[PDB]
From Swiss-Prot, chain A:
It is linked to Myopathy with extrapyramidal signs: An autosomal recessive disorder characterized by early-onset proximal muscle weakness with a static course and moderately to grossly elevated serum creatine kinase levels accompanied by learning difficulties. Most patients develop subtle extrapyramidal motor signs that progress to a debilitating disorder of involuntary movement with variable features, including chorea, tremor, dystonic posturing and orofacial dyskinesia. Additional variable features include ataxia, microcephaly, ophthalmoplegia, ptosis, optic atrophy and axonal peripheral neuropathy. An homozygous partial MICU1 deletion is responsible for a disorder manifesting in childhood with fatigue, lethargy and muscle weakness. The disease is caused by variants affecting the gene represented in this entry. Phosphorylation at Ser-18 by AKT1 impairs its maturation and stability. This is Calcium uptake protein 1, mitochondrial. One of its GO terms (biological process) is calcium import into the mitochondrion. The chain holds residues 105 to 476 of 476 of the full protein. Changing residue 79 to A: Abolishes homooligomerization. Changing residue 269 to A: Abolishes mitochondrial Ca(2+) uptake. GO terms for molecular function: calcium channel inhibitor activity; calcium channel regulator activity; calcium ion binding; calcium ion sensor activity; identical protein binding; protein heterodimerization activity. It comes from Homo sapiens. The keyword Cytoplasm does not apply. Ca(2+) 1 binds at residues 89, 91, 93, 95, 100. Changing residue 111 to A: Does not affect interaction with MICU2 in presence of calcium; decreased interaction with MICU2 in absence of calcium.
Swiss-Prot record, chain B:
This is Essential MCU regulator, mitochondrial. Essential regulatory subunit of the mitochondrial calcium uniporter complex (uniplex), a complex that mediates calcium uptake into mitochondria. Required to bridge the calcium-sensing proteins MICU1 with the calcium-conducting subunit MCU. Acts by mediating activation of MCU and retention of MICU1 to the MCU pore, in order to ensure tight regulation of the uniplex complex and appropriate responses to intracellular calcium signaling. Component of the uniplex complex, composed of MCU, EMRE/SMDT1, MICU1 and MICU2 (or MICU3) in a 4:4:1:1 stoichiometry. The number of EMRE/SMDT1 molecules is hovewer variable, ranging from 1 to 4 copies per uniplex complex, leading to uniplex complexes with distinct gatekeeping profiles. Interacts (via its C-terminal poly-Asp tail) with MCUR1; the interaction is direct. Unprocessed form interacts (via transit peptide) with MAIP1. A motif (GXXXX[G/A/S]) lies at residues 34-38. The GXXXX[G/A/S] motif at the C-terminal part of the transmembrane region mediates interaction with MCU and is required to activate the calcium-conducting pore in the uniporter complex. The poly-Asp region at the C-terminus mediates interaction with the polybasic region of MICU1. Its main location: mitochondrion. The chain holds residues 48 to 101 of 107 of the full protein. The gene is SMDT1.
Length: 306, 54
């Protein structure tokens, strides 16, 4: 199907760019939102009884401000999220009242019955603490990751290496049109491989999410022309992200990304991509692209020293 | 035709000196130049991550 193909391409494109109001208006009922529609809007090219989305489904339709808050809780890392919470709390005591939360959520109302029942009681009184806040953070992130995992049809509770590589390359919204060839080659490169159990990809995704600190943690490798390595990646993931990584996952990431290199995975190869994609918070599809391409080409050409 | 209005014969046709040499001395080098151009263009298309055959 060609027409449905271009429809899904345009939906994915409007998902990638111009998110805040255009997406929320693009998915609705009949001005509010529904949880399954939210899940549809957060997944590209596309009732629970145990999920968070079930709890919201029991609750009333989601608001636009709630949508913004959900985007931020999905986006920001853990430490920055703790800082954001500390900024949420206006009063001294470490508990966000319903009134101050209402103020800092109404501050987003620019185009001029919420998730409160999950944070507060039906009386809209029960104030929460930082512990419940981080618990909701972790629960929502693990839940969306579980949903994405199960969307890829698993075998024996496991996922082909090509599928994991495709999910990874889809996480960083970069269309190199050449890394897809590496994704395709990963299958034969890992002929009759393992199944990449959910815990391995979970650990790798939490590590990738906590990369803003990983970058500054290995800053000595930068400023020295150094390049990454298997053991060093193991170490930095164990120290900063505080989680283990199986050697197979590091192997498949190396095989996916270290294309120009010979197994070293320098800054421009892997870390820069994720560090830039984590900062998404800041025919027309030809001008800017061609300009950037030409700029890079001219820079590479002029790269002939003094 | 081979004869004029009378029975006279037309002159010998002019033949270029060293014809095949002057032809094959300009065909082959440009085949090589075209090969080089195509190779470099394919390399550059693969460099800009535009067209990668697989």
């Amino acid at each position: 199907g060609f027409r449905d193909r271009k429809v899904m391409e345009y939906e994915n494109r409007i998902r990638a760019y111009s998110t805040p109001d255009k997406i929320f208006r693009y998915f609705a009922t009949l001005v509010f939102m529904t949880p399954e529609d939210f899940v549809r809007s957060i997944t590209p090219n596309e009732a629970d009884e145990g999920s968070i989305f079930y709890t919201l489904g029991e609750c009333g339709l989601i608001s636009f401000s709630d949508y913004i808050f959900l985007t931020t809780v999905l986006s920001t890392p853990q430490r920055n999220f703790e800082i954001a919470f500390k900024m949420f709390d206006l009063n001294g005591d470490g508990e966000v009242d319903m009134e101050e939360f209402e103020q800092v959520q109404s501050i987003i109302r620019s185009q001029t019955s919420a998730l409160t029942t999950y944070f507060f009681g039906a009386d809209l009184k029960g104030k929460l603490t930082i512990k419940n806040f981080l618990e909701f953070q972790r629960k929502l992130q693990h839940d969306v990751l579980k949903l994405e995992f199960e969307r890829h049809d698993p075998v024996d509770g496991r996922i082909t290496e090509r599928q994991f590589g495709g999910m990874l390359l889809a996480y960083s919204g970069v269309q190199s049109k050449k890394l897809t060839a590496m994704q395709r080659q990963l299958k034969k490169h890992f002929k009759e491989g393992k199944g990449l159990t959910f815990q391995e990809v979970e650990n790798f995704f939490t590590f990738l999410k906590n990369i803003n600190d990983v970058d500054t943690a290995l800053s000595f490798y930068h400023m020295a022309g150094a390049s990454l390595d298997k053991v060093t990646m193991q170490q930095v993931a164990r120290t900063v992200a505080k989680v283990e990584l199986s050697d197979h996952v590091c192997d498949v990431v190396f095989a996916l990304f270290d294309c120009d290199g010979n197994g070293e995975l320098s800054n421009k190869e892997f870390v820069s991509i994720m560090k830039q994609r984590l900062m998404r918070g800041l025919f027309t599809r030809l001008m800017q692209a061609m300009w950037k391409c030409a700029q890079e080409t001219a820079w590479d050409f002029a790269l002939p020293k003094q | 035709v081979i004869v004029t209005r009378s029975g006279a014969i037309l002159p010998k046709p002019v033949k270029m000196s060293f014809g095949l040499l002057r032809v094959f001395s300009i065909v082959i080098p440009f085949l090589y130049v075209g090969t080089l151009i195509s190779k470099n263009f394919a390399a550059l298309l693969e460099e800009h991550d535009i067209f990668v055959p697989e």
